[PDB]
């Protein structure tokens, strides 16, 4: 009954999180990708400097 109650209350809260965070995690994880390309661009140009 804890598997009945506590699992489904978390599944309701995680999908309410999936509406709100999984749009903004994709905003976060791709803004992470803006750092990881600007990191290797900065290293090669200080080499070029």
């Amino acid at each position: 009954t804890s598997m009945k109650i506590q699992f489904k209350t978390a599944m309701p809260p995680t999908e309410v999180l999936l509406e709100s965070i999984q749009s903004k995690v994709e905003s976060i994880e791709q803004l992470q990708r803006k750092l990881q390309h600007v990191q290797p661009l900065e290293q090669q140009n200080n080499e070029m400097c």
Partner: protein
């Protein structure tokens, strides 16, 4: 998410400060690149003249 925005702009700030300074290096050497080619040309211009002058002198 705003924290990741303020961290990201600093690297793209550092992307300019290298790129402006590395072209400030190449802008200076190119002027030195064109000066030596000017002096080497008058050297080569005087070189071919003397090679043909001494043949005509003899």
């Amino acid at each position: 998410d705003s924290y990741l925005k303020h961290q990201e702009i600093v690297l793209d700030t550092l992307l300019p400060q290298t790129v402006s300074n590395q072209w400030r290096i190449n802008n200076d050497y190119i002027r030195q690149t064109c000066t030596i080619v000017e002096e080497m040309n008058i050297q080569q211009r005087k070189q071919i003249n003397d090679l043909e002058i001494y043949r005509k002198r003899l």
